[PDB]
């Protein structure tokens, strides 16, 4: 049951405060318009980080 995760997975990368500035960064972000494997207790791979959205 594939699902399009539209624009989820944006987090603050650093512990610094900014305001009204367009900041360009580079890190492990979830790509936009990706497809997520819906599940329903199986062992799953952990490549470099897992976005564990849940209801």
């Amino acid at each position: 049951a594939y699902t399009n995760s539209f624009t989820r997975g944006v987090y603050y990368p650093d512990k610094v405060f900014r305001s009204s500035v367009l900041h360009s960064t580079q890190d492990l972000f979830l790509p936009f318009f990706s497809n997520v494997t819906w599940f329903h207790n199986p062992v799953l791979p952990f490549n470099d980080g897992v976005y564990f959205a849940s209801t």
Binding site: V16, F17, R18
Partner: protein, 163 residues
């Protein structure tokens, strides 16, 4: 601050921090707001005043006294004071007259000898032409004038070797 060495003047910051930041910044890398490691508050950092120094002189041949202008800082911490829109100058007496003036300073204020007075320049003599729709003015006499101007065309020819 915990290894962060910095110079500036501190103030009670008014910005707000989320409970997980430690220090803010601005365009490029300008640390302004810091959170103290013991008493848990926020203080913002701003530069203390600094600038260049200018000297206004009417010529050694004429007189032997000058005026000092500070560009940047205004005359509140500079240990005949006068405040302008570009720094502040000390040593000149401010007058309330307007003359077509000598050495310019800035923002329309210019100082000149008279004992080194600073004022606001005057654009020129003001006259109002009596315009009318039933009268014209015709000259009766004429004069011949001679005007000069100088234009450079070339400079010295120089050659420089390497070895």
């Amino acid at each position: 601050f915990n290894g962060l060495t910095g110079t500036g003047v501190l103030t009670e910051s008014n910005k707000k921090f989320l409970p997980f930041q430690q220090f803010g910044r601005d365009i490029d890398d300008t640390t302004d707001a810091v959170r103290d490691p013991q008493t848990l508050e926020i203080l913002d950092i701003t530069p203390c005043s600094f600038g260049g120094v200018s000297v206004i002189t009417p010529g050694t041949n004429t007189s032997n006294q000058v005026a000092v202008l500070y560009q940047g800082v205004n005359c509140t911490e500079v240990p005949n004071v006068f405040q302008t829109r570009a720094g502040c100058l000390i040593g000149a007496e401010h007058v309330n007259n307007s003359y077509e003036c000598d050495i310019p300073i800035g923002a329309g204020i210019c100082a000149s000898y008279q004992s080194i007075i600073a004022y606001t320049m005057s654009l020129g003599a003001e006259n109002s032409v009596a315009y009318s729709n039933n009268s014209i003015a015709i000259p009766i006499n004429f004069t011949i004038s001679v005007t000069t101007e100088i234009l450079p065309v070339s400079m010295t020819k120089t050659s420089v070797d390497c070895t």
